[model samples]
Target chain A: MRLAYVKNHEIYGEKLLGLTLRERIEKTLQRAGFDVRFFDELSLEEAEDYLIILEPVLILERDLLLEGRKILVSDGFTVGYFFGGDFRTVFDGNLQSSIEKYLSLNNLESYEIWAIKLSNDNLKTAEKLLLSSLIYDGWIAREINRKVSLRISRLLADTSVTPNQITVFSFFLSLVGSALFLLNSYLTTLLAGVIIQLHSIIDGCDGEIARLKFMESKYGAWLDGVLDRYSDFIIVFSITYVLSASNPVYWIIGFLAAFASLMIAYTGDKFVAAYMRTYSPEGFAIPITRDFRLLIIFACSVVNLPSLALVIIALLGNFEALRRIVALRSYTN
Target chain B: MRLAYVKNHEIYGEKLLGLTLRERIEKTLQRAGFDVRFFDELSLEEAEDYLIILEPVLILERDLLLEGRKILVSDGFTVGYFFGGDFRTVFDGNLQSSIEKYLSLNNLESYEIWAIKLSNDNLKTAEKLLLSSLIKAKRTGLKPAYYDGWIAREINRKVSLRISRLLADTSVTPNQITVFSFFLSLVGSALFLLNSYLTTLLAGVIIQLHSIIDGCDGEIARLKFMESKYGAWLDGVLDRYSDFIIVFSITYVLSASNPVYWIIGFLAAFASLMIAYTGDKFVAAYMRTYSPEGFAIPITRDFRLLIIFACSVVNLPSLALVIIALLGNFEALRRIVALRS
Candidate 1:
């Protein structure tokens, strides 16, 4: 069948996971033995001769099930099958089970359904049609830091700053803040505490701009994950140094605090990475992550009660690691 | 402009995860607001009236980089927009900068691509597309064809795949398949109970066959996209019940010999399910994915059952239960330490 690779202006125009919709379609079509042609580029005669009307779905595959007659494509991707050139029912939105039946039957929820077709009579619709809505992210970065970072993202998007540069920059930013924690003076330490909090918020900027620019990768992710764990370790390790001078007991408390916080982040990140190899779902949501934990450190340190922060980190961080051990009991045991 | 959606037979006719490739297309096209229609179902006049042709690519989105001239597609699935459809010349095939861009950007990969994708031409292209070859199995099950499950993996998986291939084309669901396996076990259980040597021996084979066929429901569900926790729950619970019953029957028969059968049955039951239950229970407990590596837990379900088959053939059901008692618990513990460690 002749294929006209008309881009879906709605989803196609935007970049997903870094790939523009058009590039993904063209590359795959070339592999599928399609003589790929574009929407505006296709001659009217060429379109009439086309057998498949491929279109990209805006929503992830699972949402395809939410509507019927229509294929709810998921994060993975699926194709809407309307066979042998019957192009009459594309706009008929009755949630027809035909498409959903195939998708639902295959467990293609998160799988990609790259294209949707109607019939041979289809016109490559370039008229911008809005399809999917946004999914809510429960992350603190997503929830609270998202707006601020996205605003930061815009300012950085057109700039010459690379994401790794920001990542390296963010690490240095934390280290600078961590270095500030070593001073004995209250005013300097207090200023340091607020800077660390600002670091937590700025830490979000690299991700925001990366996602914003679609400039993300696995190598960078592992490094990024490692850096954050180190970030947690540095902050606590720094905190321990200053507090230890005040009392000998603070030495052990500081050690326990730094150790627990590091373990919590390290274990969680490693376990999460491993868990993903077997279970292909979203990562489990921990109640407290580096964002919230760092904030707690900042707040407690500023109030002259670094011990209070130490207790939370030691108790909760250790509790969090143990929680994962128990949490994975369902699948790993 | 009027829209026409033509389903590709290769993708549309077969269900990946449960939905055909065609249905997946139209739903999205419908979302795109095209009055799309199907190919086999379209009129001659409708052919002339349409302006565009569409197709799904069999290559996955990640593979877009594997080939060139592509911008990767991700969420709301967005892309690495070098823009205006500037899909550079593909086939340069570089592990180069474009991909490193995003990994540098959000820190997303090896963490997980988290999902898979099919092609662009709606052609139900039976081109051995690797849209989704990976299934997220938390355990070292009867897959992998080695490392303990190879024997059962090779023999039974082929048999199970054959069965599911047939069922994949049908309306049969995994829940029903689970029930079917349950009945097969019950009948096998009765035979094992009779202890009529010949009949009991035949019962062992039948029960083992039940074990083999047990894998089909999941295969069919995955092929058809009907996999669910409920389906898993139904399958696991039924299998657990069968394990318990088989243990009960073995213990009852052996009690005449020593009555020591009861403890083995309980241990076998706990270990058998406990081995699989740990990770998911953790998932339930923490609502997260915990990947535990390097913990090779032998005495997996297939491994245990094969041992069970071996014992039944030699008139030592008690022996099989004893092996599972020791092996199962250790396997469970190994997994726990590996995950946390």
Candidate 2:
């Protein structure tokens, strides 16, 4: 037998033992040294033009045996073949009998079977594979977030906790860490950093819960903004306060640096809004969501480079704000 | 013979007088005892009652004048009036003469001329009196802010310079005086404590000049909001900065007070914006204009006992950046998402 592969769209109407099938079979037989002449619609001119062309038996169709008898007949009777239908119950007695009859009648040496229906076991296997692959790619990020978020949401659900209260809690937690950092204790400072990072995560969760639960009122939004400011202020103020206490001369510098950082962040939003009446350029487009600053900050925090993180954030934030401001001014004008 | 003041609306059909001549006459008559009455249409009964009760010899209609022949015949006099005509030249020429003639004609000797308009000679005399009074008040608790402010504005216009830039440059001359207290020194800061101070003329002038010409933008409606945010930001930031340096710092250094003043001044604008936004129950009607923080800082800066003018400016300049942030947040939430929704 000769092997051949059909392209995706080529499969169409044809009987297994019809002229088309017999033609392919006879061609295969001739190619394998059998003295057979294939009969089909191919012109002698076209066949003679090609030195060699792949042609294989196409017996994988139903209702071919009945039609093959009317087509061209050879001296050795055309092997009338029928492929079994309804192979889902391949092990069933009736199905086995049908296969046996087809093989015996066609004098077939080999045959293949395929199930047209999926079993319960196959469906379960497919679902498992899909889930496992999703987990591998971290598409389950939101899922993990949701699970952790639910735990906190349930606790806060009945407490009548205002958004400001949550923000205050975030602020206090960050402030405590910042205050501890002022003590010149590296261990405590590091611990404070860790706590601050944790606070930031919880801070995000509060907003997440509010958004998800449909509790996002104006008050909450305002409270969230105010709290964010408080958090930022406390952290920077604490840092500057501590550094300034140690070196009074550098106090102004430290304070300016902290102020600049805060200003830069503010400017980015302001400039973006002033120009386009939106908070950010990327957020203006659908393909990009979420602020890159948040990602940068988180990555920096994780890497244990808080100072570098602060400086980079300050520089980039301010630059972005300035850029937006310049652009917006020109645009509006 | 009797002096009367009439509201502009009483004479003109419009709410206020539209004619320049009428406006001038109304203002002039206001100096006398003439008070204008406001009414759309007077009923017959009301008109009769007014005529009998007030016993007015001359009744002035909106655009017409009516005179009683009995009063003229009995008193052996005649009344001259104009109807629907310009009264500017008439009022100017006969202000004193008309009152004299009316008193003579009415046989009333008790009439007096009320000094209302401060003409050229009156204004110059008043200015000198005001200067002396201000100087004396400086001896006491009051500051000579008005007099100094007047002098500064005159110089400001003459020099064609901004008050702040002028103050900034002048600080070089007096080594001991800091730029923070330059405005106060140039136009005494002590007048903030004055009661019922009419001397705000000078301070008002300087402050008005400072505010009006602070930027290159025009006040006309034709000027688009294109440069509004930037202009607002610069104005606000510089205002806070200048106030902090010149006004707030004076209290800090001179009074040696707590940091609360500085902090309050710095954060007032932010708090105001937040409060203004949150205070409104109707979310849809909420406005983002006029930060309470800006007002609060200025109030705190001015109303405080010990002035730390320079330190205040330094503190304020840094905080000015927050306005950018505040505006940014507003647009982000409201214009971007809220509008879309």
Candidate 3:
């Protein structure tokens, strides 16, 4: 059997710390027949063990429920009564069931009822009730090693995966998504979306990895650019193939779109060179970059009709080329 | 019959009096020839009358042609030959006809031709041969000014009558050559084997235009992060529209004979932008002021297309926006998200 001390109180804009005060509170509560014993400040591991052994009646503050159901489930303790709020208001209707499903999947069977104190004057009652509930849940979850997913993420950070590699992989995945469109199956397309999103996350991971490793380089930058253009072309070409198969009109638009999309980068570079030559020592502006185009395309791919989007984008792309041309002309002329 | 003199074998490259010795050659040539013979050394104005009087037998040296053609036509003389080498080579073919057209149109009567022998060099041979043919053609065409409708251009330029306005009017003309498209259609798009050649001219025009007008905005906006959203949006939209139309115009007008017309401009603009954007700003530290997105639409209105062509010839249009957006996604990203911040 494990002993634990708990306190439930409203922490309005204040930081909580230290085991001494918590122990004092536990002793005070125990003398009042609320059988409680103080444990040393628990680590996530120790807390889990305590809750699993004690399985004490738990009480919680109403505001704690607002944090999210995930936190509540992680702790392995159910609310007895939420202080100052109705049970329905404190918990989403589906919350209990979802938590139960999560618990069942993890092979957990413990449950508890909750109550709320209505009066603000009853601070001690609310505090005692809430603390016991929080401690019981926190200890149980810790003992069960419930944060396995979080642990896995932390562990993964130690692996050899580089951020640039992740980025390339993500881009590759997105290219696959683009290829899926050529299959012209709705399920495949939807799956492509999923894969594309995964790729996006992988893209994020690469940066995260780079940040972690501090291995940024000009070569990496150049590689990113080449890969990006390749990915963009693949996706655009894939969509073009799809559109061509479905609607002949879109096929022509796709051709224009493909050309225009490529030209967007061209005009920007030329414009910057012209601008630099005319204006100052500054080389070129950044907003004219292709990474931005990738982001926009990524966003559009998920929600927009691929052919229509490409057509509309193609129109804009060509117009940009002309504007850059005109700007350059005026500069040198 | 106007007496015109050409001093055969007179060297004109040295100095004479305050003027260069080339002036003495012109003076000697004029004095030897009778009539109100204007020396090639005369200003562009006096040269116009000589071209008018010696209608057919006109010397077609680069400088002489420049002076005469300038007065007869308000349009500047298209004399790029004096620069030498390839220019001389290219000029030789059109130089003879260009000179004859100038003289006959100016109503110059038949005149004598004297050969001035310059140094025995390739440039001089090309130049003299070109000039002699021009004089010969001028002599032939002086008789019937009204014989060919083609001579009407000369009459229009020479005649002071208000009726010139009526003749100039294009409305009633059955086959009006849109000056904008005439060269591109007849020559540029149709004749050029490589689209890159045409597209380069197209890209060059755009690059030049952007460079010229890049100063219109605040230096600070250009230097630091200072572009307004609306300005950026406008810039972006217009750019895309211009790029698409320019390329489309080339492709549509030129067709398959010059696929480069369809490919190179777009490829160049896209590739250049992508490479540049990656190095600066996000990769480096500069803040982006403009977005490259709006520069992609392709509309083919005839009048606008013509303006673009004209702009290209004059060297004023650019492909900056298209290049930046195509190549630099991060820059484009900054543009899209930048809200005056």
Candidate 4:
């Protein structure tokens, strides 16, 4: 379907997440797979053509259902109109009341119209639109991480910080966090574990920032994901080193733990590449996510049992890997 | 341009790589990205249409350069033709001489024709055509065109090709062979835990044998025209698993004396996985398999297993871990840098 903006429309001209209001509308429509024309370029000629108002309004629904109605209303305002041939309306007072009275002149039966009723604020509308829940987030991510990240995202959304920059910053935090374990002191281990948790928290921010700022890209997500694996390995390696001075047997446990951690990530990545979908944690009944694992390490470090942390990571990581392997058996060729 | 096989085209009916002559031709044309019509579906209309003679002949060139020709000649026979309108050719004595006389009657200047003159045989032509040198190859491929690897060139490939040929006629599948090889490595790696010199030697021998048998799975897969995405993934996954087990077993024995040996082993095992991880991610990013052989490094799987065997023979297992740790990370770094720049 083709869409055009109404003539002499009110151009909001305000930029939301680096995109002007009309630019965002055009991007939204184009991303929705519609052939759209601007206000000046409207060679409008069709029964199902749309003439959108240039107010600061965004489509909350996945698609607009415009079958019978000539006017599309949102929160008591006429947002757009669809017409076959001739169109007639009168502006008496406010745009919404004027169109309502004009339609009321023809009686309620003849004026069959539909309303979306999605409340909007010209300033907070974009931010509110981005408040939708993430589908694939783990428990810690949904409950804890988003709580902190969304605040930081709103603060940074108007800044020059890009999502990829946020990704690099979070990686640098993990790097420093992992390096702290080399000190092999009780305080440093505690500090490193805390920092690792912080890294996990900040890790959610980049994607949050991406979603908030309309800067999401597959390349950015892929870079963040691969770096997450490397960061995970280094953190495990350093923690293993810290425990190695106490006993050599723990080194064996450490090796198994670190390798199992990597294997978990490996299986997930391989599954995604194979099936083009995530290996959901709901299927496995174990969190086994980076957030949960790092949280375990943090809790163990606080209680001064980093060795126990290694043991837990090993047990959980390897069992989860085995679970995935057995679960994916039927998918093999 | 469209291609249609000639009517009553001699279906040689012999299977090459499990594909009959016509089947192979159709596959080749489709793989070359063309709209192909079989012998019975001759709705021929176009100036650049092709009529193929299914006589067990495979086009050896990248593409056939047929511009101004009514008949295509291969050696002394008319193999195929290209025509705009009225298609007429006689097969008097031999097809080539008949077409030459028909074009000769029309006069040499008007008959402007082209010939590929590719040599062909009824049975051996397909095998000879398959003899073309593999491009995008490393040093080992040039010393001998069919060489699988530098070490494999002399030792394993001979046995591998023979086994592959024998397996082609059997009911065995490639995924089965992959799992069997993995089982062999697991058994071999487990033997290292016995901690005796005799067990070490046996373990080394078993792993080397597993390495040799490994080639047959891929070779037979290619020969039988069966390749699977899950099979490749399983092969890689099992390779890493067995590698860690073997390295861990060797380290477990040595670390009893000096605990530092465990660190070195851990580094080696981590580097080994990183090498594969980088290569896999490279393919994910670029859609091409990252070949370390392209970097001219002997750090591939065969050499890796060979070093373990040699180290086990001389009772220098620590040296093997150090070498692998160094070479694996070096190659991994090289791959990352190559991908970036």
TM-scores of all candidate predictions against the true structure? 0.38, 0.37, 0.31, 0.73
lDDT of 3 by residue, A242-325 (tens): 765566455446556666666564344333332332122133332222433444455555664666557665676656555554
Tens-place lDDT digits, model 3, residues B1-341 = 22332222234443211223344334433433424334433222211122222211223222232222132221232211111112222222343554454434444322223323234344335343432222112332221101112222232112212221232222322111112122223333332223455564654444323322222221112112133333332333343333444444444334344433333344433333333333232222233322233442121121223344455554433332223333444433333234223
Candidate 1 displacement at residue A78 in angstroms: 16
**Runs in model 2 with CA error above 4 Å?**
A1-162, A268-277, A282-310, B1-341
Candidate 2 residue-wise lDDT, B1-341, digit = tens: 22232222322322111123244334333332333342233222112101111111211111221233122121333322211112222233434453344434444222111112223334344323222221212221221111122332333223322222233223122111222223442342233223113332333333334433332121110011122445433323233333323332222222234443333433433332322222221222122322222112222212121112222233332232244234423533343233222
Model 2 docking tier (incorrect/acceptable/medium/high): incorrect
Error of 3 at B57 (Å): 44
Query: Interface RMSD in Å per candidate, to 1 decimal?
Result: 14.7, 8.8, 13.2, 4.1
Q: Which runs in model 4 stand beyond 4 Å of their true positions?
A: A1-12, A26-37, A40-122, A131-135, A211-219, A275-282, A331-333, B1-12, B17-53, B58-159, B196-198, B286-298, B334-341
Cα lDDT listed for each candidate? 0.53, 0.34, 0.37, 0.64
Candidate 1 local lDDT, residue A24: 48
Which sections of candidate 1 miss by over 4 Å? A1-4, A7-37, A41-139, A277-286, B1-341
Rank candidates by lDDT, best first: 4, 1, 3, 2
C-alpha positional error of residue A214 in candidate 3 after TM-score superposition, expressed in Å: 1.9
- How well does model 1 score by local distance difference test? 0.53
CAPRI grade, predicted model 4: incorrect
lDDT of 2 at B268: 35
